[PDB]
Design an enzyme around this catalytic site. Structure first.
Site, PDB file in Angstrom:
ATOM      1  N   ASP A 198     -12.021  -2.106 -15.685  1.00 19.48           N
ATOM      2  CA  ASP A 198     -11.663  -0.975 -16.537  1.00 19.48           C
ATOM      3  C   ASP A 198     -10.145  -0.839 -16.610  1.00 19.48           C
ATOM      4  O   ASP A 198      -9.483  -0.757 -15.578  1.00 19.48           O
ATOM      5  CB  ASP A 198     -12.279   0.316 -15.993  1.00 19.48           C
TER       6      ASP A 198
ATOM      7  N   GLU B 114      14.296 -11.412  -1.898  1.00 21.84           N
ATOM      8  CA  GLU B 114      13.328 -12.175  -1.120  1.00 21.84           C
ATOM      9  C   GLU B 114      12.738 -13.286  -1.988  1.00 21.84           C
ATOM     10  O   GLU B 114      11.629 -13.752  -1.744  1.00 21.84           O
ATOM     11  CB  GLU B 114      12.219 -11.273  -0.565  1.00 21.84           C
TER      12      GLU B 114
ATOM     13  N   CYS C 221      11.940  -5.917   0.694  1.00 26.95           N
ATOM     14  CA  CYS C 221      12.441  -5.064  -0.382  1.00 26.95           C
ATOM     15  C   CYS C 221      13.553  -4.121   0.078  1.00 26.95           C
ATOM     16  O   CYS C 221      13.897  -3.172  -0.624  1.00 26.95           O
ATOM     17  CB  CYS C 221      11.294  -4.248  -0.981  1.00 26.95           C
TER      18      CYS C 221
ATOM     19  N   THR D 270       0.451  -5.203  -9.919  1.00 23.22           N
ATOM     20  CA  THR D 270       1.675  -4.570  -9.438  1.00 23.22           C
ATOM     21  C   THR D 270       2.907  -5.450  -9.665  1.00 23.22           C
ATOM     22  O   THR D 270       4.041  -5.019  -9.442  1.00 23.22           O
ATOM     23  CB  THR D 270       1.569  -4.251  -7.939  1.00 23.22           C
TER      24      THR D 270
ATOM     25  N   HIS E 111      11.276   3.608  -2.832  1.00 16.01           N
ATOM     26  CA  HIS E 111      10.757   2.273  -3.018  1.00 16.01           C
ATOM     27  C   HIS E 111       9.256   2.438  -3.074  1.00 16.01           C
ATOM     28  O   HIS E 111       8.696   3.274  -2.365  1.00 16.01           O
ATOM     29  CB  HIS E 111      11.087   1.337  -1.869  1.00 16.01           C
TER      30      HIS E 111
ATOM     31  N   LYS F 203       1.222   8.705  -3.159  1.00 19.24           N
ATOM     32  CA  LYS F 203       0.390   8.977  -1.986  1.00 19.24           C
ATOM     33  C   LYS F 203       1.218   9.162  -0.714  1.00 19.24           C
ATOM     34  O   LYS F 203       0.882   9.988   0.137  1.00 19.24           O
ATOM     35  CB  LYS F 203      -0.641   7.860  -1.795  1.00 19.24           C
TER      36      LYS F 203
HETATM   37  C1  F24 Z   1       8.785  -4.740   0.062  1.00 16.07           C
HETATM   38  O1  F24 Z   1       9.242  -4.373   1.115  1.00 16.07           O
HETATM   39  C2  F24 Z   1       7.399  -5.371  -0.048  1.00 16.07           C
HETATM   40  C3  F24 Z   1       7.592  -6.839  -0.494  1.00 16.07           C
HETATM   41  O2  F24 Z   1       8.142  -7.501   0.617  1.00 16.07           O
HETATM   42  C4  F24 Z   1       6.498  -4.606  -1.066  1.00 16.07           C
HETATM   43  O3  F24 Z   1       6.975  -3.290  -1.106  1.00 16.07           O
HETATM   44  C5  F24 Z   1       4.999  -4.496  -0.649  1.00 16.07           C
HETATM   45  C6  F24 Z   1       4.212  -5.815  -0.733  1.00 16.07           C
HETATM   46  C7  F24 Z   1       2.684  -5.642  -0.524  1.00 16.07           C
HETATM   47  C8  F24 Z   1       2.046  -4.485  -1.328  1.00 16.07           C
HETATM   48  C9  F24 Z   1       0.506  -4.615  -1.551  1.00 16.07           C
HETATM   49  C10 F24 Z   1      -0.176  -3.366  -0.988  1.00 16.07           C
HETATM   50  C11 F24 Z   1       0.086  -4.773  -3.045  1.00 16.07           C
HETATM   51  C12 F24 Z   1      -1.380  -4.912  -3.363  1.00 16.07           C
HETATM   52  C13 F24 Z   1      -2.079  -6.122  -2.863  1.00 16.07           C
HETATM   53  C14 F24 Z   1      -2.126  -3.862  -3.759  1.00 16.07           C
HETATM   54  C15 F24 Z   1      -3.427  -3.961  -4.444  1.00 16.07           C
HETATM   55  C16 F24 Z   1      -3.638  -3.197  -5.705  1.00 16.07           C
HETATM   56  C17 F24 Z   1      -4.328  -4.886  -4.110  1.00 16.07           C
HETATM   57  C18 F24 Z   1      -5.727  -4.536  -3.619  1.00 16.07           C
HETATM   58  O4  F24 Z   1      -6.383  -5.491  -3.153  1.00 16.07           O
HETATM   59  O5  F24 Z   1      -6.112  -3.351  -3.713  1.00 16.07           O
END
Ligand code: F24
Length: 387
Positions: A33, A83, A115, A156, A237, A246
């Site tokens: 969706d 990175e 990040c 994302t 960030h 959240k």
């Molecule tokens: C920065 O510090 C960092 C990259 O080094 C960044 O902020 C976060 C990276 C990882 C974020 C994950 C939570 C993204 C993701 C997999 C979310 C979702 C929608 C996937 C899921 O399976 O629900």
């Protein structure tokens, strides 16, 4: 007392590639969706780039939007936080220094910590200028956030850069000395040598992200006595817009109804651009700052802005800036909107092809692209750029 030297962000801008894919198109291709991406994750348009554009391309384009002749003469330090490095030894900052025509007697280097890299650059630049008030520093966040086709993190994704000019008597944001830093050894997200895509424990990352803000905030509050009521806005960030909300929601649970609405409204303003771009990793916080400043209409000189920076691994920092009178005359709203509006909308087929393509630096080749500072050729693994 007043009259003390101020130090901080004098000019700031972002750049993203001239391509995107709409989350509805992605959602449909992924048999999901569209609301799940648009609202559940909180992203609308994903910035995507071809192999002819790297962090140097984005950094150069972002920096060119703000640097003048006098800036180029006064800068003696150039920093890239990323990175998504393309070399294990040579800092991307070195090429940026050449392309920007910055005066030769400067030091240039790259900072790496997920990040958080650009934030490390910002605070160090601040200290540098404090000791050398006649000089300036170019700090650029640059990254390419790709998780993988059909991956949880795909919606994302993003790509681009955010460039900042740090100086004394900054025209936009004056930085305070109220920094609270934190380091924890946690493997929520990392990328071992040889991995084109990251290793990620989504759960652990979200948990650590949320708790890291709580932790630096509580310590800050304990050191300074300042609370949410003392902040006109907060820039974060974010891994994606909903998770950012959240983390914020979790910490303001004990605030009055009116303060929650005020603060949440500010957050919404800070994620206008991110919704049309995606995650810039190092640049995410600072895109949020630009978005806040260019989309808010009730922010004013003297307002206090709280900034939360995060790096998987993990490192975090909370610090404060004050808006400088006249700042509204030194933003780039028109340019940013034109930048976002002039992108090509990729089909799912065009997206997946551009995403999958890889640059093999072991093969000499020529690359064609209209973008300034894009890669023009590879020779003996060495990238040439337009200039
Ligand atoms: C920065 O510090 C960092 C990259 O080094 C960044 O902020 C976060 C990276 C990882 C974020 C994950 C939570 C993204 C993701 C997999 C979310 C979702 C929608 C996937 C899921 O399976 O629900």
């Amino acid at each position: 007392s007043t009259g003390s030297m101020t130090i901080g962000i004098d000019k700031i801008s972002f750049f993203v590639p001239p391509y995107y894919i709409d989350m509805t198109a992605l959602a449909e291709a992924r048999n999901v969706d569209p609301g799940k991406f648009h609202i559940g994750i909180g992203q609308d348009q994903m910035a995507v780039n071809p192999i002819s554009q790297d962090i140097v391309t984005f950094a150069a384009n972002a920096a060119e939007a703000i640097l003048t002749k006098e800036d180029k003469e006064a800068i003696d330090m150039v920093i890239v936080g990323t990175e998504s490095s393309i070399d294990e030894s040579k800092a991307a900052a070195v090429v940026l220094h050449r392309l920007m025509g910055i005066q030769p007697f400067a030091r240039s280097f790259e900072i790496k910590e997920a990040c958080y890299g650009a934030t490390a650059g910002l605070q160090l630049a601040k200290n540098h200028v404090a000791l050398h008030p006649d000089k300036k520093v170019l700090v650029v966040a640059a990254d390419i956030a790709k998780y993988g086709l059909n991956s949880g993190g795909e919606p994302t994704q993003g790509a681009g850069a955010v460039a900042m000019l740090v100086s004394s008597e900054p025209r936009i944001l004056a930085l305070k000395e109220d920094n609270v830093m934190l380091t924890q050894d946690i493997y929520d997200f990392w990328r071992p040598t040889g991995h084109p895509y990251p290793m990620v424990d989504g759960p652990l990352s979200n948990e650590t992200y949320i708790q890291s803000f709580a932790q630096v905030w509580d310590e800050h509050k304990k050191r300074t006595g300042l609370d949410f009521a003392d902040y006109d806005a907060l820039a974060f960030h974010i891994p994606y817009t909903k998770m950012g909300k959240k983390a914020l929601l979790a910490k303001i649970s004990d605030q009055t109804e009116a303060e929650q609405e005020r603060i949440l409204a500010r957050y919404e303003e800070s994620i206008i651009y991110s919704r049309r771009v995606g995650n810039l990793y190092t640049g995410s916080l600072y895109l949020g700052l630009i978005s806040l400043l260019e989309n808010a209409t009730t922010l004013t000189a003297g307002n206090q802005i709280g900034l939360f920076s995060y790096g998987s691994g993990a490192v975090a920092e909370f610090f404060t800036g004050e808006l400088v009178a006249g700042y509204q005359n030194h933003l780039q709203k028109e340019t940013h909107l034109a930048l976002l509006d002039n992108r090509t909308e990729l089909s799912i087929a065009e997206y997946e092809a551009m995403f999958a393509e890889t640059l093999d630096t072991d093969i000499d080749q020529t690359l064609e692209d209209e973008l300034k500072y894009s890669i023009s050729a590879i020779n003996n693994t060495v990238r040439s750029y337009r200039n």
